[PDB]
Assembly symmetry: D2
Homo-oligomer: 326 residues x 4
Amino acid sequence: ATLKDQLIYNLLKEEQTPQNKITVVGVGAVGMACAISILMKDLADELALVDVIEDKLKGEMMDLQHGSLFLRTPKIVSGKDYNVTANSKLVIITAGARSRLNLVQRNVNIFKFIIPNVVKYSPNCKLLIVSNPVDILTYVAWKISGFPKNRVIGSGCNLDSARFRYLMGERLGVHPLSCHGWVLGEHGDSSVPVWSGMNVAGVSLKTLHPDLGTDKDKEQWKEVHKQVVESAYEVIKLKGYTSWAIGLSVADLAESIMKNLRRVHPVSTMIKGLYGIKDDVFLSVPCILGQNGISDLVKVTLTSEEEARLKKSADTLWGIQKELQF
Amino acid sequence: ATLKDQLIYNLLKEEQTPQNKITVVGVGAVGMACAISILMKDLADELALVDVIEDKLKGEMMDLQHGSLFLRTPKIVSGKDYNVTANSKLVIITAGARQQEGESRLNLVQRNVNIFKFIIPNVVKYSPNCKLLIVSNPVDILTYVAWKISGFPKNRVIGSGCNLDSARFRYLMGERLGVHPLSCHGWVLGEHGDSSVPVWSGMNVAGVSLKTLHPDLGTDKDKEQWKEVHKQVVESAYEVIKLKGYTSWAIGLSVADLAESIMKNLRRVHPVSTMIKGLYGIKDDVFLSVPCILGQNGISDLVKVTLTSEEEARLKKSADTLWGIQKELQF
Amino acid sequence: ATLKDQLIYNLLKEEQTPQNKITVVGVGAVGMACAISILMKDLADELALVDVIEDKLKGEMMDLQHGSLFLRTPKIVSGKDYNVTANSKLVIITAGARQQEGESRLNLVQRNVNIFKFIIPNVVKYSPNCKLLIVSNPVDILTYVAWKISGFPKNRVIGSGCNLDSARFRYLMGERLGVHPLSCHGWVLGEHGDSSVPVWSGMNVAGVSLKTLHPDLGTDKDKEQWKEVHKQVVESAYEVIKLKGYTSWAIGLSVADLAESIMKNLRRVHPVSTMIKGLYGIKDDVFLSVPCILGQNGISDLVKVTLTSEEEARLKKSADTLWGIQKELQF
Amino acid sequence: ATLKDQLIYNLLKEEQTPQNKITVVGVGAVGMACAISILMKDLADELALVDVIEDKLKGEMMDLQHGSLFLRTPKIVSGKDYNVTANSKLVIITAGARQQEGESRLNLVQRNVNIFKFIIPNVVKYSPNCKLLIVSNPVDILTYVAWKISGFPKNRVIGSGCNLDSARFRYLMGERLGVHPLSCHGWVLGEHGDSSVPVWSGMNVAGVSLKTLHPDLGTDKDKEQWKEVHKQVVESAYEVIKLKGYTSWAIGLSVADLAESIMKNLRRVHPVSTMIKGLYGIKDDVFLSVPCILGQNGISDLVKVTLTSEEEARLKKSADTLWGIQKELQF
Ligand SMILES: NC(=O)C1=CN([C@@H]2O[C@H](COP(=O)(O)OP(=O)(O)OC[C@H]3O[C@@H](n4cnc5c(N)ncnc54)[C@H](O)[C@@H]3O)[C@@H](O)[C@H]2O)C=CC1
Ligand SMILES: NC(=O)C1=CN([C@@H]2O[C@H](COP(=O)(O)OP(=O)(O)OC[C@H]3O[C@@H](n4cnc5c(N)ncnc54)[C@H](O)[C@@H]3O)[C@@H](O)[C@H]2O)C=CC1
Ligand SMILES: NC(=O)C1=CN([C@@H]2O[C@H](COP(=O)(O)OP(=O)(O)OC[C@H]3O[C@@H](n4cnc5c(N)ncnc54)[C@H](O)[C@@H]3O)[C@@H](O)[C@H]2O)C=CC1
Ligand SMILES: NC(=O)C1=CN([C@@H]2O[C@H](COP(=O)(O)OP(=O)(O)OC[C@H]3O[C@@H](n4cnc5c(N)ncnc54)[C@H](O)[C@@H]3O)[C@@H](O)[C@H]2O)C=CC1
Ligand SMILES: C[C@@H](Sc1nc(-c2ccc(Cl)c(Cl)c2)c(C#N)c(=O)[nH]1)C(=O)Nc1ccc(S(N)(=O)=O)cc1
Ligand SMILES: C[C@@H](Sc1nc(-c2ccc(Cl)c(Cl)c2)c(C#N)c(=O)[nH]1)C(=O)Nc1ccc(S(N)(=O)=O)cc1
Ligand SMILES: C[C@@H](Sc1nc(-c2ccc(Cl)c(Cl)c2)c(C#N)c(=O)[nH]1)C(=O)Nc1ccc(S(N)(=O)=O)cc1
């Protein structure tokens, strides 16, 4: 018989449906950073990669597979066909392009193909949307998939808040893990730094320093949030794109989802009902993440100005959204 | 009183050196895969990055920094100037030209040797007690070059070598046998390149010799053509390069595997590029992979593999080929 | 208008079924060491503890829970009633009675049978599809007992067997050679404890066979007395018990390693106790350790190790002894 | 030659000191919990254990060693003689007496002072530059004793203090809110144990102050009696002890978390016991818990929490009480 059969006696020939499977759709810079970060955190027992560029997709799969000895994810697969994504617990969408409106429409056209395919093979997965513009595309994925809002999550301001805490820790000489602060609302340009919640060891910086984040602030802490916004552009300008930070951010979200941790993360969720907002829009607020996606959200007390900014974002997003062609 | 002063009382200042600093030279596809892997393995308390392309360097540094919340490495720095690398315990060199589709790693010698002539003395100046881990291709030749230029004892000059080839081999073995690569044991030695040598005589699962079970294993007569598995290992980089343009993730993980053994003084055995003079009647100062014990002083010991007459001939051929190249280098 | 409602808006209250649940039955030193190791390796999303000693049980649960901030297992439960164990992927049995001075093997085994007669039906009731991992001694016999009572297929009943014996062997081997145990390979098979069998032919570093280098290895003509390494594997277990009263840490770590392969579907090879009828020469329903492929279905395959005449005879004798005892048991 | 010499060619003999060494003094339930958690977090390249009970010490050491295959800490040692602790970066003291029937609390305190009178000089002798982490109770008093005896600067003497109390508080908060403790923020400061102070103003999720949302929080008029949460923090300490006889897992995990920040120079903030003279009107040499930045040189900075008059008066009362005891201790 074969060497295998001489070496190994078989008790039974499998095979179970995937138990802890994650799919990443789009193997560009962001998708692959998510993939490697998820692999090194041992979050999945099966990883599937999808893309439309077939040679790239195969080469990325093979590169990862060659590192199998150093990982604890025993099955890595890829394909243009969504059959490879069947029974995923979590499906991460990083596909797309990176004026504006026509760009949104290009990514919407992409989602019109991707989302139905995802749902067909994993009708009960959680969807985590990373593609930009992320808040708008999370709404698009929600409408197309027909999923309940708990199962559709935008990476949203998780990255923005990580940047903010990195910058805060640099200023204070404290690890980011111990520097707490929340950036909410729209990802990117219009995000909102919640000054009232910035604290170390529960000590409110705003209470110590009333001018915190105002124009008159002798220390111009507002510049920290300015950097949060601008640093996103600077990284793209410097290396051409961003990958590592978003990959790590996404793996953190995936960790709460896959392990049912119920930690709180600022991610994009359907916010209709809050802050005078009455349109189907997705904005980041702090959400409890677990095996059922977003099960709960924190109602952050916002100032008048902060609420106004979220409202303005909602209006803008809805304005774009009600013109999109599905 | 500033906000910081209101919030935090300082007991004492003055800086201290990092305990476990790693530098990566070259922030291209390979350097950054090494960086992320090392970061996610929590091996370093400081990571330094160096490159000659200043915008790319700063951008890569910043991208990693923005991921700090999710890491356990509190300081990430970068610069074109090697002062950013001072006091490194381990310095990983990934800079230089890579082989294009259909090009041999051996075609990169002039380019990369010349780059090493600038890099290595700079590294040594700022971290005279570091271990050097060479990744740039052709890796065996460049380990020899790094060793010669640095003036380090050879224990502290390590080539990533066949750790990756052996990983690939065990991956493919595991796919054939239906076993995780961790449980499939098999060694690929010699050149990290076309002349590498699969040690059929040592392949096993649970200590059961595959060659004993299957005498034709690895030969031309083999009905299961296991030699094709080694051919796949040889061709793997070329195939991945044809498909995605370069290789990155597997070598990044391989390097982090080696870094872990060194930084944590594990004394695990890995096939890495080192001087093999004195083994198998080889008299030249040739570098290529054999199994080595890796720890805090780098390579402390070599494991002497018993090769068949056929395996030993192939290894000697690999050594002959590589020494033909090394010997013509001028320093 | 409770603080919770002011603070948190609930989107839905649904389902909430554990996806990666593990139960430990028995919270003595072994059970709790398995528990802490499993927690620190992030293997489970829910951990359940069962024992008949209620105060001890609640105390252990609370002590683990108070450490929740430092763990990534969000739900830890306990109870004397098996409803707490519902929907476990893996159920680890460390419960049983300790042998009394002068008590016969049969009397001790029978008491454990009687204990398993209460435990196993309750486990099966609540997790009909779980894998069972038996740790309780005598482990080879009690693995058989759990298989008989549960009615589970062979693949889902696993004895920790010689997993710990082999880890001890590799520690001792590593110490002699100055190599990390990860890189020292060697297999102790058959009966856990006194009658275990060291497979000298498989002992190697980097695929280099120690027996081939040193043909007297393991014999009485061996001037280096490598046989003493296996004698230490056997004696070290008793020595630890005499010194600290019990063993806990090493068994905890070994069980966590098995749980990792099972929970993550790794298909790594481990030396564990499995129903060995029809193989290695044996015709009775007995469980002994051989290298087994472990993953999400428990033991899906096993490795057929080539044994010397002596090694084979030792396994056969163990099988004869085990069946001699088992055939007298009252179920 | 020997088998070892046939198998392995040595390049280097010269060994080097362990570079990230941790010692645990006292191998009771607390000490061994600290040990296993530190081992499973890969914080140390060498672990030393010290106790006065020789058989127990050796057995614990061996049990850990036997688990080496599953660990990344290549050297574990033990001894009654403190030479085994030489060159430790961090030394964790969990050694203590047990109060006896009829014994006064002050008498028990002095018996632990007498224990430290022997331990601390020995630790200082072999690791004059280490950080001391005091866990032994009464922890705040004994941290002062260790500081006084050692002559170390305040940054290198750290009491476990309210690290555990705070972890318990966050666990309980998390249960009430249905949120992971990692995302539930709240600080218990001052004295470890009975007289600890829950800082209501700092309790939050996502930076949303519970005290602002719910002004009655932490008062007797609290319709939800959140004060009961802190009551459970103190009460649960006694309940675990009553139920299982001692506490181990939670303290061990909390100590490993502190060790992680120190060994990896993270500069995270933890509630630990430190010299507070000069704060809150306190003018005596007393150690109480406040949030401290922990890194390579121990406590480099502390956070100056804004406290209510009532909260400030509790710490002052605690300091007066502790000083009154300390001035009467016999050194
Ligand atoms: N939410 C956030 O914080 C961040 C979001 N991003 C976004 O992530 C997206 C990707 O970024 P990059 O990876 O740098 O772009 P990229 O161009 O390198 O990769 C995109 C990949 O999507 C693939 N793709 C295109 N159409 C597809 C389809 N119909 N099905 C499957 N795959 C398809 C492309 O072939 C390409 O490989 C962009 O939208 C970018 O703006 C980037 C950084 C941060
Ligand atoms: N040992 C192994 O198994 C593998 C080795 N490699 C080798 O690694 C090397 C790098 O590959 P990639 O990162 O894909 O190339 P890359 O082109 O993406 O990056 C190379 C980087 O080296 C930098 N560099 C060039 N000269 C420099 C100097 N004097 N100082 C500092 N930096 C300098 C470049 O600016 C560039 O950023 C190649 O030689 C490649 O063949 C690649 C894969 C595997
Ligand atoms: N397979 C191996 O390599 C090793 C196996 N062991 C075995 O593991 C077993 C446990 O060891 P220890 O924890 O030290 O003993 P232990 O006596 O400290 O703990 C046993 C626990 O089982 C509980 N128990 C008894 N009857 C029960 C029932 N009907 N249901 C639930 N729980 C019950 C006891 O109350 C006790 O808490 C022993 O049989 C020991 O020999 C120990 C070391 C190694
Ligand atoms: N700070 C905290 O949050 C907590 C502190 N603790 C304290 O930790 C200490 C230890 O707790 P357990 O491990 O349960 O006590 P234990 O009595 O079980 O173990 C104490 C060990 O200290 C050893 N020891 C006594 N004198 C010694 C000496 N001169 N040199 C070396 N070792 C010596 C004993 O021999 C014994 O092995 C106690 O003081 C306890 O109160 C306990 C729980 C929490
Ligand atoms: C900081 C830039 S960096 C950046 N931005 C974009 C981007 C974002 C939004 C739009 Cl509308 C367009 Cl056209 C491009 C792309 C891309 N692609 C990219 O690769 N990088 C960014 O992400 N801006 C941003 C603005 C609004 C939204 S939202 N609230 O409408 O969802 C999302 C993102
Ligand atoms: C090394 C001791 S340490 C030890 N051994 C025992 C033990 C083991 C077997 C028997 Cl038959 C008895 Cl009566 C006691 C107990 C217990 N209880 C204990 O607490 N510690 C041991 O586990 N021996 C052992 C012998 C035979 C078997 S088997 N092949 O029959 O399953 C399993 C183990
Ligand atoms: C909740 C008990 S649980 C407990 N408490 C004690 C204990 C604590 C304090 C004293 Cl003064 C005495 Cl005599 C015993 C022991 C012990 N041993 C034990 O094993 N468990 C506790 O730890 N109390 C405690 C009180 C005061 C201090 S302080 N601020 O004066 O240092 C520290 C701890």
